[PDB]
Amino acid sequence: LSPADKTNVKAAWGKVGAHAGEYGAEALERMFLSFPTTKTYFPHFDLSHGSAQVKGHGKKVADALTNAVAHVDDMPNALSALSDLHAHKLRVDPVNFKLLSHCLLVTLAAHLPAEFTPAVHASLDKFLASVSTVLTSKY
Protein backbone atom coordinates (compact mmCIF):
# COMPACT_ATOMS: atom_id res chain seq x y z
CA LEU A 1 0.00 0.00 0.00
CA SER A 2 1.46 3.29 -1.16
CA PRO A 3 1.53 6.41 1.05
CA ALA A 4 -1.21 7.92 -1.11
CA ASP A 5 -3.27 4.74 -0.69
CA LYS A 6 -3.03 5.02 3.09
CA THR A 7 -3.96 8.71 3.00
CA ASN A 8 -7.00 7.92 0.85
CA VAL A 9 -8.15 5.05 3.07
CA LYS A 10 -7.86 7.13 6.24
CA ALA A 11 -9.89 9.81 4.38
CA ALA A 12 -12.68 7.78 2.69
CA TRP A 13 -13.26 6.17 5.94
CA GLY A 14 -12.89 8.87 8.55
CA LYS A 15 -16.03 10.05 6.76
CA VAL A 16 -17.72 6.72 7.58
CA GLY A 17 -17.52 7.62 11.28
CA ALA A 18 -20.23 6.22 13.54
CA HIS A 19 -22.14 4.82 10.54
CA ALA A 20 -19.42 2.17 10.25
CA GLY A 21 -21.51 -0.38 12.14
CA GLU A 22 -24.53 0.24 9.91
CA TYR A 23 -22.45 0.16 6.72
CA GLY A 24 -21.02 -3.28 7.50
CA ALA A 25 -24.53 -4.59 8.11
CA GLU A 26 -25.54 -3.22 4.70
CA ALA A 27 -22.46 -4.75 3.07
CA LEU A 28 -23.39 -8.20 4.41
CA GLU A 29 -27.00 -7.90 3.23
CA ARG A 30 -25.72 -6.85 -0.19
CA MET A 31 -23.48 -9.93 -0.20
CA PHE A 32 -26.26 -12.26 0.98
CA LEU A 33 -28.73 -11.02 -1.65
CA SER A 34 -26.32 -10.77 -4.58
CA PHE A 35 -24.28 -13.93 -3.88
CA PRO A 36 -26.56 -16.38 -2.03
CA THR A 37 -23.80 -19.01 -1.83
CA THR A 38 -22.34 -16.94 1.02
CA LYS A 39 -25.40 -17.40 3.25
CA THR A 40 -24.47 -21.01 4.07
CA TYR A 41 -21.75 -19.68 6.40
CA PHE A 42 -24.55 -18.18 8.55
CA PRO A 43 -27.13 -20.97 8.90
CA HIS A 44 -27.63 -19.85 12.52
CA PHE A 45 -28.27 -16.21 11.59
CA ASP A 46 -31.62 -14.69 10.72
CA LEU A 47 -30.45 -13.04 7.50
CA SER A 48 -33.68 -11.07 7.02
CA HIS A 49 -33.81 -7.29 6.68
CA GLY A 50 -33.19 -5.47 9.94
CA SER A 51 -31.94 -8.61 11.68
CA ALA A 52 -30.31 -7.84 15.02
CA GLN A 53 -27.69 -10.51 14.28
CA VAL A 54 -26.70 -9.03 10.92
CA LYS A 55 -26.46 -5.59 12.52
CA GLY A 56 -24.41 -6.94 15.42
CA HIS A 57 -22.09 -8.82 13.08
CA GLY A 58 -21.79 -5.93 10.63
CA LYS A 59 -20.49 -3.84 13.53
CA LYS A 60 -17.85 -6.47 14.29
CA VAL A 61 -16.80 -6.52 10.62
CA ALA A 62 -16.60 -2.73 10.47
CA ASP A 63 -14.64 -2.57 13.74
CA ALA A 64 -12.13 -5.09 12.39
CA LEU A 65 -11.65 -2.89 9.33
CA THR A 66 -11.19 0.12 11.63
CA ASN A 67 -8.51 -1.83 13.49
CA ALA A 68 -6.87 -2.64 10.14
CA VAL A 69 -6.61 0.98 8.98
CA ALA A 70 -5.35 1.88 12.46
CA HIS A 71 -2.55 -0.70 12.04
CA VAL A 72 -2.26 -0.62 8.25
CA ASP A 73 1.53 -1.11 8.37
CA ASP A 74 1.25 -4.29 10.47
CA MET A 75 -2.08 -5.83 9.42
CA PRO A 76 -0.86 -9.47 9.56
CA ASN A 77 -0.26 -9.12 13.30
CA ALA A 78 -3.41 -7.05 13.91
CA LEU A 79 -5.63 -9.44 11.92
CA SER A 80 -3.75 -12.53 13.17
CA ALA A 81 -6.54 -14.02 15.28
CA LEU A 82 -9.13 -13.29 12.59
CA SER A 83 -6.94 -15.10 10.06
CA ASP A 84 -6.93 -18.25 12.19
CA LEU A 85 -10.70 -17.98 12.66
CA HIS A 86 -11.65 -17.51 9.01
CA ALA A 87 -9.23 -20.14 7.67
CA HIS A 88 -9.08 -22.79 10.41
CA LYS A 89 -12.46 -22.76 12.17
CA LEU A 90 -14.72 -21.38 9.45
CA ARG A 91 -12.68 -22.40 6.38
CA VAL A 92 -14.06 -19.47 4.41
CA ASP A 93 -13.76 -19.94 0.68
CA PRO A 94 -11.21 -17.33 -0.50
CA VAL A 95 -13.60 -16.42 -3.33
CA ASN A 96 -16.00 -15.09 -0.71
CA PHE A 97 -13.59 -12.38 0.46
CA LYS A 98 -13.80 -10.81 -3.01
CA LEU A 99 -17.60 -10.84 -2.83
CA LEU A 100 -17.76 -9.04 0.53
CA SER A 101 -15.04 -6.59 -0.54
CA HIS A 102 -17.05 -5.69 -3.65
CA CYS A 103 -20.16 -5.15 -1.51
CA LEU A 104 -18.12 -3.03 0.92
CA LEU A 105 -17.07 -0.83 -2.01
CA VAL A 106 -20.66 -0.62 -3.25
CA THR A 107 -21.85 0.32 0.24
CA LEU A 108 -19.22 3.06 0.52
CA ALA A 109 -19.98 4.39 -2.97
CA ALA A 110 -23.68 4.63 -2.13
CA HIS A 111 -22.97 6.52 1.12
CA LEU A 112 -19.93 8.69 0.22
CA PRO A 113 -20.73 10.63 -2.97
CA ALA A 114 -17.76 12.97 -2.63
CA GLU A 115 -15.14 10.57 -1.25
CA PHE A 116 -15.53 7.67 -3.68
CA THR A 117 -13.26 9.16 -6.35
CA PRO A 118 -11.53 6.92 -8.91
CA ALA A 119 -8.29 7.20 -6.92
CA VAL A 120 -9.95 6.58 -3.54
CA HIS A 121 -11.92 3.73 -5.12
CA ALA A 122 -8.61 2.25 -6.27
CA SER A 123 -7.02 2.71 -2.84
CA LEU A 124 -9.97 1.15 -1.00
CA ASP A 125 -9.87 -1.86 -3.33
CA LYS A 126 -6.16 -2.32 -2.61
CA PHE A 127 -6.86 -2.00 1.12
CA LEU A 128 -9.60 -4.64 1.09
CA ALA A 129 -7.49 -7.03 -0.99
CA SER A 130 -4.69 -6.77 1.57
CA VAL A 131 -7.15 -7.49 4.38
CA SER A 132 -8.50 -10.39 2.33
CA THR A 133 -4.97 -11.64 1.67
CA VAL A 134 -4.28 -11.59 5.42
CA LEU A 135 -7.55 -13.33 6.31
CA THR A 136 -6.81 -16.11 3.76
CA SER A 137 -3.12 -16.57 4.64
CA LYS A 138 -3.67 -19.29 7.26
CA TYR A 139 -5.06 -22.31 5.37
Binding site: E26, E29, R30, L33, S34, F35, H102, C103, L105, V106, T107, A109, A110, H111, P113, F116, T117, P118, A119, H121, A122, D125
Partner: protein
Protein backbone atom coordinates in the same frame (compact mmCIF):
# COMPACT_ATOMS: atom_id res chain seq x y z
CA UNK B 1 -33.13 -15.47 -15.20
CA UNK B 2 -34.63 -12.32 -13.66
CA UNK B 3 -37.93 -12.10 -11.82
CA UNK B 4 -40.57 -9.49 -12.66
CA UNK B 5 -39.46 -7.64 -9.52
CA UNK B 6 -35.79 -7.70 -10.54
CA UNK B 7 -36.60 -6.66 -14.11
CA UNK B 8 -38.73 -3.87 -12.64
CA UNK B 9 -35.80 -2.83 -10.44
CA UNK B 10 -33.29 -2.91 -13.30
CA UNK B 11 -35.22 -1.02 -15.99
CA UNK B 12 -36.50 1.67 -13.62
CA UNK B 13 -32.93 2.55 -12.66
CA UNK B 14 -31.54 2.18 -16.18
CA UNK B 15 -34.02 4.71 -17.55
CA UNK B 16 -32.27 7.33 -15.41
CA UNK B 17 -28.77 6.44 -16.66
CA UNK B 18 -26.81 9.16 -18.46
CA UNK B 19 -25.70 6.92 -21.32
CA UNK B 20 -23.21 9.55 -22.52
CA UNK B 21 -21.28 9.50 -19.21
CA UNK B 22 -21.74 6.26 -17.28
CA UNK B 23 -19.93 4.02 -19.78
CA UNK B 24 -16.76 6.10 -19.74
CA UNK B 25 -16.95 6.54 -15.98
CA UNK B 26 -16.80 2.76 -15.55
CA UNK B 27 -14.15 2.02 -18.19
CA UNK B 28 -11.99 4.73 -16.63
CA UNK B 29 -12.31 3.31 -13.12
CA UNK B 30 -11.50 -0.13 -14.53
CA UNK B 31 -8.29 1.27 -16.04
CA UNK B 32 -7.44 2.97 -12.74
CA UNK B 33 -8.40 0.24 -10.26
CA UNK B 34 -7.14 -2.72 -12.33
CA UNK B 35 -4.30 -1.01 -14.22
CA UNK B 36 -3.32 -4.14 -16.16
CA UNK B 37 -6.38 -3.58 -18.35
CA UNK B 38 -4.55 -0.54 -19.76
CA UNK B 39 -2.49 -3.09 -21.69
CA UNK B 40 -5.38 -3.21 -24.18
CA UNK B 41 -5.66 0.59 -24.55
CA UNK B 42 -2.14 1.70 -25.45
CA UNK B 43 -3.52 3.75 -28.35
CA UNK B 44 -5.69 5.84 -26.01
CA UNK B 45 -2.69 7.93 -24.96
CA UNK B 46 -2.45 9.58 -21.55
CA UNK B 47 -3.41 7.05 -18.87
CA UNK B 48 -0.66 8.20 -16.49
CA UNK B 49 -2.93 9.58 -13.75
CA UNK B 50 -6.49 8.97 -12.55
CA UNK B 51 -7.42 12.46 -13.75
CA UNK B 52 -5.79 11.74 -17.11
CA UNK B 53 -7.79 8.53 -17.58
CA UNK B 54 -11.16 9.96 -16.57
CA UNK B 55 -10.68 13.16 -18.56
CA UNK B 56 -9.26 11.28 -21.55
CA UNK B 57 -11.77 11.70 -24.43
CA UNK B 58 -11.00 8.30 -25.97
CA UNK B 59 -11.91 6.56 -22.71
CA UNK B 60 -15.22 8.43 -22.62
CA UNK B 61 -15.99 7.71 -26.28
CA UNK B 62 -15.24 3.99 -25.93
CA UNK B 63 -17.12 3.49 -22.67
CA UNK B 64 -20.15 4.93 -24.45
CA UNK B 65 -19.98 1.97 -26.84
CA UNK B 66 -19.49 -0.44 -23.93
CA UNK B 67 -22.57 0.96 -22.22
CA UNK B 68 -24.32 0.68 -25.57
CA UNK B 69 -23.60 -3.04 -25.39
CA UNK B 70 -24.96 -3.31 -21.85
CA UNK B 71 -28.19 -1.57 -22.86
CA UNK B 72 -28.65 -4.10 -25.67
CA UNK B 73 -28.11 -6.92 -23.19
CA UNK B 74 -30.75 -5.51 -20.85
CA UNK B 75 -33.22 -5.58 -23.76
CA UNK B 76 -32.45 -9.27 -24.46
CA UNK B 77 -31.91 -10.79 -21.02
CA UNK B 78 -33.34 -14.06 -22.39
CA UNK B 79 -30.88 -14.36 -25.32
CA UNK B 80 -27.63 -12.82 -24.09
CA UNK B 81 -25.58 -15.46 -25.92
CA UNK B 82 -26.75 -14.38 -29.37
CA UNK B 83 -26.61 -10.68 -28.52
CA UNK B 84 -22.92 -10.80 -27.56
CA UNK B 85 -21.80 -13.42 -30.11
CA UNK B 86 -19.84 -11.03 -32.33
CA UNK B 87 -18.49 -9.17 -29.29
CA UNK B 88 -17.44 -12.55 -27.86
CA UNK B 89 -15.52 -13.42 -31.03
CA UNK B 90 -13.85 -10.00 -30.84
CA UNK B 91 -12.93 -10.07 -27.15
CA UNK B 92 -12.07 -13.79 -27.15
CA UNK B 93 -10.63 -14.95 -30.48
CA UNK B 94 -9.15 -11.57 -31.46
CA UNK B 95 -8.27 -9.55 -28.34
CA UNK B 96 -7.64 -12.49 -25.97
CA UNK B 97 -8.95 -10.57 -22.97
CA UNK B 98 -9.12 -12.91 -20.00
CA UNK B 99 -12.84 -13.25 -19.15
CA UNK B 100 -12.16 -12.46 -15.48
CA UNK B 101 -11.87 -8.84 -16.62
CA UNK B 102 -15.48 -8.97 -17.85
CA UNK B 103 -16.60 -9.75 -14.30
CA UNK B 104 -14.42 -6.91 -13.01
CA UNK B 105 -15.77 -4.36 -15.49
CA UNK B 106 -19.28 -5.48 -14.56
CA UNK B 107 -18.64 -5.04 -10.84
CA UNK B 108 -17.00 -1.67 -11.52
CA UNK B 109 -20.18 -0.66 -13.33
CA UNK B 110 -22.19 -1.74 -10.28
CA UNK B 111 -19.99 0.57 -8.20
CA UNK B 112 -20.61 3.44 -10.62
CA UNK B 113 -24.37 2.91 -10.37
CA UNK B 114 -24.16 2.85 -6.57
CA UNK B 115 -22.05 6.01 -6.69
CA UNK B 116 -24.57 7.91 -8.82
CA UNK B 117 -27.82 6.63 -7.27
CA UNK B 118 -26.87 6.37 -3.59
CA UNK B 119 -29.67 5.08 -1.38
CA UNK B 120 -31.68 4.33 -4.53
CA UNK B 121 -29.24 1.52 -5.40
CA UNK B 122 -30.64 -0.74 -2.70
CA UNK B 123 -29.32 -4.23 -1.85
CA UNK B 124 -32.21 -5.82 -3.78
CA UNK B 125 -31.55 -3.52 -6.74
CA UNK B 126 -27.89 -4.54 -6.62
CA UNK B 127 -28.78 -8.24 -6.56
CA UNK B 128 -30.71 -7.85 -9.81
CA UNK B 129 -27.80 -6.03 -11.47
CA UNK B 130 -25.26 -8.61 -10.28
CA UNK B 131 -27.31 -11.16 -12.22
CA UNK B 132 -27.26 -8.86 -15.26
CA UNK B 133 -23.52 -8.20 -15.30
CA UNK B 134 -22.79 -11.86 -14.54
CA UNK B 135 -24.86 -12.89 -17.55
CA UNK B 136 -23.16 -10.34 -19.81
CA UNK B 137 -19.70 -11.50 -18.73
CA UNK B 138 -20.66 -15.15 -19.25
CA UNK B 139 -22.15 -14.35 -22.67
CA UNK B 140 -19.10 -12.32 -23.70
CA UNK B 141 -16.91 -15.29 -22.68
CA UNK B 142 -18.95 -17.91 -24.57
CA UNK B 143 -16.22 -18.24 -27.19
CA UNK B 144 -13.94 -19.57 -24.43
CA UNK B 145 -16.57 -22.12 -23.37
Amino acid sequence: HLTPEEKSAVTALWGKVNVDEVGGEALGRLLVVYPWTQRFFESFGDLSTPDAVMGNPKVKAHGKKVLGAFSDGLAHLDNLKGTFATLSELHCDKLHVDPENFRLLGNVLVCVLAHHFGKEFTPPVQAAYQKVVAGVANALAHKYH
